[PDB]
Amino acid sequence: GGRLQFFKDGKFILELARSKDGDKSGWVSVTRKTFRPP
Amino acid sequence: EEKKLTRDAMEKYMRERNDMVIVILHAKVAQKSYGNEKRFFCPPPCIYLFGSGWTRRYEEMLQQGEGEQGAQLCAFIGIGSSDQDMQQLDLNGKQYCAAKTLFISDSDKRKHFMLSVKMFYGNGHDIGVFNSKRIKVISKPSKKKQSLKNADLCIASGTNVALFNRLRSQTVSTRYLHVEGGHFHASSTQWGAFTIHLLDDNESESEEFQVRDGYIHYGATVKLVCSVTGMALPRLIIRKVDKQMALLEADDPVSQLHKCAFYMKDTDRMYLCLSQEKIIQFQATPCPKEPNKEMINDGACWTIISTDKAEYQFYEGMGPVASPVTPVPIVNSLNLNGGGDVAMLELSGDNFTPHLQVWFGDVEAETMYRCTETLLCVVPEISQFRGEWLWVRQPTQVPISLVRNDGIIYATGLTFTYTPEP
Amino acid sequence: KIEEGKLVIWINGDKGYNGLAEVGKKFEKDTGIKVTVEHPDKLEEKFPQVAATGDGPDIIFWAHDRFGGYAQSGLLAEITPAAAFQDKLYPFTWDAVRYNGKLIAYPIAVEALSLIYNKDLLPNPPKTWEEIPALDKELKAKGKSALMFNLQEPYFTWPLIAADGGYAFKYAAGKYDIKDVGVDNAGAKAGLTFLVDLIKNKHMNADTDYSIAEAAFNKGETAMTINGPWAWSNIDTSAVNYGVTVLPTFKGQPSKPFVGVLSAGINAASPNKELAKEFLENYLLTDEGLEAVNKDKPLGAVALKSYEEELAKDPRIAATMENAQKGEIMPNIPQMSAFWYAVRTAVINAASGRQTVDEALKDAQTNITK
Numbered sequence: 001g002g003r004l005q006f007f008k009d010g011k012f013i014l015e016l017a018r019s020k021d022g023d024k025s026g027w028v029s030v031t032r033k034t035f036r037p038p
Numbered sequence: 039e040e041k042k043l044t045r046d047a048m049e050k051y052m053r054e055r056n057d058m059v060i061v062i063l064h065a066k067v068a069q070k071s072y073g074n075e076k077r078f079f080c081p082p083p084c085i086y087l088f089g090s091g092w093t094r095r096y097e098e099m100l101q102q103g104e105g106e107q108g109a110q111l112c113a114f115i116g117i118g119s120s121d122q123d124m125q126q127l128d129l130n131g132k133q134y135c136a137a138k139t140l141f142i143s144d145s146d147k148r149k150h151f152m153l154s155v156k157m158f159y160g161n162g163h164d165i166g167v168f169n170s171k172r173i174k175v176i177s178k179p180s181k182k183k184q185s186l187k188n189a190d191l192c193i194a195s196g197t198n199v200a201l202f203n204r205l206r207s208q209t210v211s212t213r214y215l216h217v218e219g220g221h222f223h224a225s226s227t228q229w230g231a232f233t234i235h236l237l238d239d240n241e242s243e244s245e246e247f248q249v250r251d252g253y254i255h256y257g258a259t260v261k262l263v264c265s266v267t268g269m270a271l272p273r274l275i276i277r278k279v280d281k282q283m284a285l286l287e288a289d290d291p292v293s294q295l296h297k298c299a300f301y302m303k304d305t306d307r308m309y310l311c312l313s314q315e316k317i318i319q320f321q322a323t324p325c326p327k328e329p330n331k332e333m334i335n336d337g338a339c340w341t342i343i344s345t346d347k348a349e350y351q352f353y354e355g356m357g358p359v360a361s362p363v364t365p366v367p368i369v370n371s372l373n374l375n376g377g378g379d380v381a382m383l384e385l386s387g388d389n390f391t392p393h394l395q396v397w398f399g400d401v402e403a404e405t406m407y408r409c410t411e412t413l414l415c416v417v418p419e420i421s422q423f424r425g426e427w428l429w430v431r432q433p434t435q436v437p438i439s440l441v442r443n444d445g446i447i448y449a450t451g452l453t454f455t456y457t458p459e460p
Numbered sequence: 461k462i463e464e465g466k467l468v469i470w471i472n473g474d475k476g477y478n479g480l481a482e483v484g485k486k487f488e489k490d491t492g493i494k495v496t497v498e499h500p501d502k503l504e505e506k507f508p509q510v511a512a513t514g515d516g517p518d519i520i521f522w523a524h525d526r527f528g529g530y531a532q533s534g535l536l537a538e539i540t541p542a543a544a545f546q547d548k549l550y551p552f553t554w555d556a557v558r559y560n561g562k563l564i565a566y567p568i569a570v571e572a573l574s575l576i577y578n579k580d581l582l583p584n585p586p587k588t589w590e591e592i593p594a595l596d597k598e599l600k601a602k603g604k605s606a607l608m609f610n611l612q613e614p615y616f617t618w619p620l621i622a623a624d625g626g627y628a629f630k631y632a633a634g635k636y637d638i639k640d641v642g643v644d645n646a647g648a649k650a651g652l653t654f655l656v657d658l659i660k661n662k663h664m665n666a667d668t669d670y671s672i673a674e675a676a677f678n679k680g681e682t683a684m685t686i687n688g689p690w691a692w693s694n695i696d697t698s699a700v701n702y703g704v705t706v707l708p709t710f711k712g713q714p715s716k717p718f719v720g721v722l723s724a725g726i727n728a729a730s731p732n733k734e735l736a737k738e739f740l741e742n743y744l745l746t747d748e749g750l751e752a753v754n755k756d757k758p759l760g761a762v763a764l765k766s767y768e769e770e771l772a773k774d775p776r777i778a779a780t781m782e783n784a785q786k787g788e789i790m791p792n793i794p795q796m797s798a799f800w801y802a803v804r805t806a807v808i809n810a811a812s813g814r815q816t817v818d819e820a821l822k823d824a825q826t827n828i829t830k
């Protein structure tokens with residue numbers, strides 16, 4: 001899958017990844033270095 | 039004849055990127071003029087022009103038969119109230135111009151204001167009105183410990199400052215810390231904006247130095263770095279100045295328009311000092327009466343002030359337009375907007391109108407106007423960039439533009455990459 | 461943005477677009493509706509970029525592999541032909557344009573690559589890829605080469621890569637498994653190694669593209685080429701006496717071309733959907749409409765049963781279908797372009813020496829599934 005990374009004056013500000021199987025795509029925000037306990 | 043931007047016109051723009059750039063460098067605070075005495079803004083607000091587009095437009099107008107006077111750039115600067123009493127800037131054919139006679143009288147009761155730069159050609163063709171960032175009106179700094187009276191009066195690590203020295207009974211009144219040709223100077227015509235970095239007390243001398251946050255206090259080890267060249271001075275100790283003496287005991291926060299001295303860390307009482315346009319080290323004499331006080335030269339007393347910058351970029355994608363290019367839309371942040379059936383990209387900023395479209399490179403996106411501070415867009419098809427994976431050396435930083443119905447392209451400082459999921 | 465009361469069509473530059481424009485002129489004479497046929501470069505990438513903002517053509521032509529990606533983004537109008545019209549085309553061609561249970565385009569023609577050879581330079585073309593180095597040495601001594609074909613597009617090199625075991629997506633449990641890619645297995649590596657060895661030994665050049673290979677074959681400088689039915693017209697007008705035959709085998713196994721079905725989709729943003737349907741069903745998909753296109757650039761084995769039967773005796777079409785039977789009809793799933801982009805770079809990087817065969821394919825394997 002591909003990932004979108006946005007930069008404001010060369011500084012990383014946002015990352016988007018594609019939405020899962022259900023149902024269409026679609027973009028979701030992502031924090032790859034953050035674990036959220038359930 | 040108002041014309042929409044074509045993909046061909048965007049492709050042409052993306053080849054050279056010759057955006058018209060206007061920079062306004064200024065102080066974040068301004069001291070008031072009580073009575074009749076005018077206290078001119080110091081350092082003087084500076085207007086910079088960048089890009090080959092300015093000279094190109096001038097030559098196009100001369101070949102169109104506008105004449106020298108018609109082709110000339112006209113620039114005026116004001117305080118915004120009273121609106122009528124703007125001052126001319128001699129900006130024509132120049133890289134920059136400083137506004138040396140700006141003031142705010144005691145009759146003006148505004149707590150804050152912005153500088154306004156009005157630009158047009160001699161033939162009457164309007165460019166627009168470009169604002170500085172918000173400037174706070176302040177009273178003269180007092181001899182009191184700054185107990186965080188305003189986060190605005192304090193100076194945070196990682197923020198920019200100007201440093202100047204006022205000369206008494208001299209033909210040159212004021213000198214500013216400035217970098218040129220890899221050297222620090224005490225210039226009479228130019229001033230630099232220096233990033234002031236807070237360092238740990240045990241941090242050694244080096245160029246690739248540490249990261250520390252918080253407000254700058256007296257007695258702190260600081261690094262002054264040129265925001266344009268990256269040139270730095272060696273480690274300094276920012277110290278409070280009283281009369282003509284440095285106060286070692288001072289631990290209070292550094293405030294706007296405070297007179298301060300910079301002790302060269304790990305030297306024998308050497309202080310950052312001017313001698314004409316030169317920057318030197320000058321040795322302080324210890325006070326015989328007071329133990330924690332050192333007598334410094336007049337050239338070693340620097341006034342500190344926080345600075346800011348306003349930057350505007352525009353491009354006539356479909357050639358000259360009948361309407362001003364201002365207010366220039368500004369994008370401060372991006373977020374994904376969940377509220378609604380389809381997850382849209384949200385652009386937060388200022389000066390948005392229903393006449394703006396978001397473009398991802400040369401691809402126009404479906405744009406929804408919400409209010410003057412918010413635009414939403416559907417991320418367009420960008421999977422063609424998978425054609426570049428393992429072909430380009432580094433992922434392409436694709437520019438995001440705001441395009442007006444008349445073809446004006448506004449560069450936003452925003453870029454995106456499209457890369458494989460890790 | 462798309463203009464109502466007119467039709468704009470996009471079709472690739474290698475297809476019979478002048479023949480299609482003749483069908484458009486007949487449509488205009490009978491209906492008063494002007495038909496504009498365009499062949500923009502990268503039309504298959506531009507279509508999802510412009511159709512998402514209400515722009516683009518009313519009708520888009522491309523092989524069926526691109527269409528599932530367009531349908532997933534809501535860019536195509538659903539195709540609902542009457543039973544009597546649907547029965548006029550081969551069921552397997554409708555299967556190529558069926559996505560998530562819906563017909564998303566009209567099938568036009570079936571295409572497959574074949575080996576094309578110059579009968580005067582080479583009366584007995586090689587049955588195997590393995591005998592091409594010795595043949596090239598023999599032809600080089602007379603100032604000729606054995607084989608020239610497009611090395612820039614993975615469509616042309618895929619039959620060899622697939623021969624010993626390479627595959628795009630594994631089909632399992634009623635669907636294509638987008639996580640099971642077959643571009644870095646032993647079979648794919650053997651096929652690409654053989655191709656890179658041909659370049660290393662100077663039997664082929666890494667820079668050979670479509671126009672270079674076509675000019676060389678059509679001028680009689682190379683004994684063989686690899687191409688599809690669309691290329692036959694330009695050979696007909698040359699002085700070359702050519703044959704169209706089975707692709708060479710590799711490691712005793714047939715070359716497996718990915719079979720394309722040229723298809724016509726209707727833009728979901730079009731205000732002329734009924735005019736587009738009338739043009740496609742009543743004008744194009746007729747013996748007369750397909751003949752006008754086929755006379756310009758051969759279509760291959762057309763989807764229309766009556767016209768396919770008429771042309772079936774052409775030995776060049778019989779060779780196309782012999783090669784097609786040895787390969788498989790491409791998936792139409794959205795990930796197909798991801799597979800093609802990754803394989804394109806792997807072949808170019810391995811052919812140029814930028815990556816080894818193993819590293820190029822291992823990286824393509826990851827990216828095709830990413």
Ligand SMILES: OC[C@H]1O[C@H](O[C@H]2[C@H](O)[C@@H](O)[C@@H](O[C@H]3[C@H](O)[C@@H](O)[C@@H](O[C@H]4[C@H](O)[C@@H](O)[C@@H](O)O[C@@H]4CO)O[C@@H]3CO)O[C@@H]2CO)[C@H](O)[C@@H](O)[C@@H]1O
Nearest residue numbers: 425474502504505523525526613614615720797800801804
């Ligand atoms: O920068 C990378 C290149 O990107 C673009 O090319 C991509 C296409 O967008 C993808 O769709 C794919 O192309 C496939 C094509 O979808 C598939 O049908 C087949 O194409 C055959 C076609 O069926 C046949 O009728 C005839 O026209 O020959 C075509 C092949 O030349 O195979 C294609 C892949 O080889 O992948 C390609 C990249 O490989 C863009 O158009 C390029 O300009 C760009 O360089």
